[PDB]
Amino acid sequence: WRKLIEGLRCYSERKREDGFWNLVCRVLKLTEDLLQTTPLNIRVKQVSVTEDEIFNNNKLRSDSWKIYDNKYRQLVSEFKKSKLVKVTPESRLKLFELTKFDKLPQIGEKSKRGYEFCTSCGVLPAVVIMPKEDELEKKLIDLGIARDEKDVRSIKNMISPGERLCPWCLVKRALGAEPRLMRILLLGDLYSVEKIVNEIVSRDVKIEIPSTSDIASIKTFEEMIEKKNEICEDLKEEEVCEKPSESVLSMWQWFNKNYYNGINLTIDPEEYWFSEKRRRYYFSVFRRHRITFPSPYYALVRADSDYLGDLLEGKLTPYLAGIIDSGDYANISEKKEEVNKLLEEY
RNA sequence: GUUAAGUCUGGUUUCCCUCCAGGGUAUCUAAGCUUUGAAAAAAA
Ligand SMILES: Nc1ncnc2c1ncn2[C@@H]1O[C@H](COP(=O)(O)OP(=O)(O)NP(=O)(O)O)[C@@H](O)[C@H]1O
Ligand SMILES: [Mn+2]
Ligand SMILES: [Zn+2]
């Protein structure tokens, strides 16, 4: 984490002017000792083994195949014993004097109430506070979150109005504006932080990461690819029927075989059809063109296996899911009829 | 023996409906529209 935050500092210093990175540099300079601690904690347990119970005098003994599972169960039991206590990473930080006095650095709205919470964690105090809107062009300069009129767009693109970021939230959003810094944390003590930040500080590879508005319009995109221009007459000059720029390539395999067909996929539909001003317009264009109106709904899909732990620990519960259970393995003889029926034929 | 004269009566009673069938079958809602547009983060 130290390496990656120092690399973020370096890269933000390099793009000191390229927008949203002046601010990343400014915050990494302001709150440095906060970011010294990683937003993720780890539990680490350790069981050992001796020559005893595995060797008799100089060769094996009986029950020697019975220690590896024994030690592994020791490890799993110590892990699940620890699991009884949950410590949040935010509890690592020394935020007492920062919040007891107004010595908390706040860019944007100086909070009237000492400090505000971040809208992305809800738990930590914010360091960057962008207004919702009253003018949205000088009110983000009169607050000093930006110094010039050119970085207004540069920041308003990455940090939305009304948003309040914590140090960690901003570090993440920065790593997201440029996802290749993680190579520092990825190559694993093989290069130097400076070598890699200098390797990727030359090339300008605009990585793209979809939003929820992107997904809620997939089949819209897919449609426009076929009905290319027969329904793009009012939208030719709205940069939605424009050209692919240089090399914008993404981890999203669907984005990488529909980007060049003629409809730029790097536009963000929250302004075009998922907007509230340009909405009555795009929908009115699509009525006379008889195409599907996008539905404002995606599907978050999560999958979890069943009983993987005791599967790796040898319990037959993932076989008899529901009938036998984890607790049934405190008196496993009691399910003799239903357990002996299984490994018998296994 | 003779004569002479006919007179009375001119439809009554009972039965006036009984029994079965008193609705059956089909259709029992259909197709649309299932929220939209303004307000998402405000001054002290
Ligand atoms: N022994 C292990 N080896 C590797 N990964 C593990 C091990 N134990 C747990 N994990 C992972 O750490 C997390 C443990 O959470 P969890 O997934 O709830 O445990 P579990 O063993 O899968 N029981 P389950 O609730 O059925 O999933 C998961 O992401 C697991 O993949
Ligand atoms: Mn699991
Ligand atoms: Zn935050």
Angle between helices A167-177 and A2-14 (to 10 degrees): 60
In the numeric block, the tokens 């992107």 are attached to A214
Query: CB of residue A279 closer than 7 A to nucleic acid strand B?
Result: yes
Q: Among all strands, which nt has the closest C1' to A113 (CA)?
A: B44
Question: Is A232 one of the annotated binding-site residues?
Answer: no
A305 is in an annotated binding site: yes
Q: How far is the CA of A93 from the centre of ligand 3 (A)?
A: 14
| CB-to-strand B under 7 Å, chain A 169-188 | none
What is the C-alpha radius of gyration for chain A, rounded to an integer number of angstroms?
28
DSSP A50-85: -STTTBSSSSB-TTGGGSHHHHHHHHHHHHHHHTTS
- A129, β-bridge pairs: A108, A164
Question: Angle, to 10 degrees, between the axis of helix A167-177 and the axis of helix A21-30?
Answer: 150
Give me the residues paired with residue A55 across strands. A60
How many Å apart are CA A200 and CA A187, to the nearest integer? 14
Q: CB under 6 Å to ligand 1: residues?
A: A 304-309, 312
Nucleotide nearest to A133 (CA to C1'): B42
Beta strands (DSSP E) in chain A are 107-108, 128-129, 164-165
DSSP A293: P
CB A93, CB A37: distance < 8 Å: yes
| Cβ atoms within 10 Å of A213's Cβ, excluding its own | 18
Residue type, A245: S
Give the distance (Å) from ligand 1 centre to CA of residue A165.
Answer: 32
Q: Name the nearest CA neighbour of A23 among A186, A143, A113.
A: A143
Experimental structure resolution, Å: 2.4
- Distance (Å) from CA A66 to C1' B14? 124
